[PDB]
């Protein structure tokens, strides 16, 4: 009954569903190859590969390499991957340095605007272009997606706890994200956000003053363990959206 009265036979829409799955995979790959721990983990893991680690069949699919171009194809793709890693090592190091500088500026308060963001974007774009054209496999992609989902679940739990602690009198849950997106650099976010509303002062004093501090400490501890803050959130969000679209198409 569910199959019949509810589901409709997709006639000539198989190719459309395949294209939708391909688009979802493209979205997931684009969200993965960005300035976060995924690009660093895929770059650091690929640094050991090629010479003494698994260079092919575990990082980049052999079919995807020569798809647009067995023994000859294996050695050809291996040398190309090694050259790409050797050329992108400096870009990945610069991107990691820029991410560390941005995390320090966000944890201290000072805004790094003297070309720091420009250098970070320039170092991240090179790594993204190198990873996208590398045609990597899904083996490490699965672990990266799992780590991103775990980090996103932890962040969502922390945000929900903060919302439940701050929404006692007259606060809501949807405003917590809007407040933390623009009031995350300063450590006294709950103190410098008391512009209007009497419920905010009561929620910040004796209501959630310790909950907000615990959430900020957890976020600071999780930033060093993996990807930093303010950059990995949107990355995991877009990768989760792509995975959800792919699962819906399937």
């Amino acid at each position: 009954r569910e199959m019949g009265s509810v589901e409709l036979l997709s006639r000539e829409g198989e190719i459309a569903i395949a294209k939708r799955i391909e688009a979802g995979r493209d979205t997931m790959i684009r969200g993965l190859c960005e300035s976060a721990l995924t690009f660093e983990a895929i770059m650091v893991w690929r640094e050991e590969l090629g010479t003494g680690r698994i260079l092919l069949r575990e990082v980049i699919d052999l079919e995807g390499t020569y798809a647009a171009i067995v023994s000859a194809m294996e050695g050809e793709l291996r040398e190309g991957v090694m050259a790409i890693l050797d050329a992108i090592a400096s870009e990945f190091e610069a991107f990691r340095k820029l991410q560390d500088k941005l995390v320090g500026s966000r944890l201290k308060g000072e805004d790094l605007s003297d070309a720091d963001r420009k250098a970070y974007e320039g170092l991240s774009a090179t790594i993204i272009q190198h990873l996208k054209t590398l045609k990597l496999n899904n083996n490490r992609i699965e672990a990266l997606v799992e780590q991103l989902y775990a980090i996103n679940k932890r962040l969502i739990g922390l945000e929900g706890r903060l919302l439940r602690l701050a929404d006692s009198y007259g606060i809501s849950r949807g405003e917590f994200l809007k407040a933390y997106f623009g009031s995350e650099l300063n450590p006294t976010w709950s103190e410098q956000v008391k512009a209007m509303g009497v419920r905010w002062t009561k929620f910040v004093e004796n209501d959630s003053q310790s909950v907000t501090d615990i959430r900020s400490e957890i976020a600071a501890l999780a930033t060093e363990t993996g990807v930093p803050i303010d950059d990995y959130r949107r990355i995991v969000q877009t990768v989760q959206k792509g995975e959800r679209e792919a699962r819906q198409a399937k």
Binding site: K19, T238, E245
Partner: protein, 53 residues
């Protein structure tokens, strides 16, 4: 071509793909197609029209 990319796809919107996902320009319709994955005509053509069984 459509008016919505693969990222700005919200709920109650068309999802019929146009073009090649591995190409440069690949977007969807992105119109009022609530209560259905695709739009009216695309869902009709994809849902095995003239259903008599």
């Amino acid at each position: 071509p459509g008016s919505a990319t693969v990222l700005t796809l919200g709920a109650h919107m068309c999802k019929w793909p146009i073009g090649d996902p591995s190409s440069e320009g690949f977007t969807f319709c992105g119109r009022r197609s609530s209560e259905g994955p695709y739009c009216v005509e695309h869902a009709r053509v994809a849902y095995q029209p003239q259903q008599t069984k």
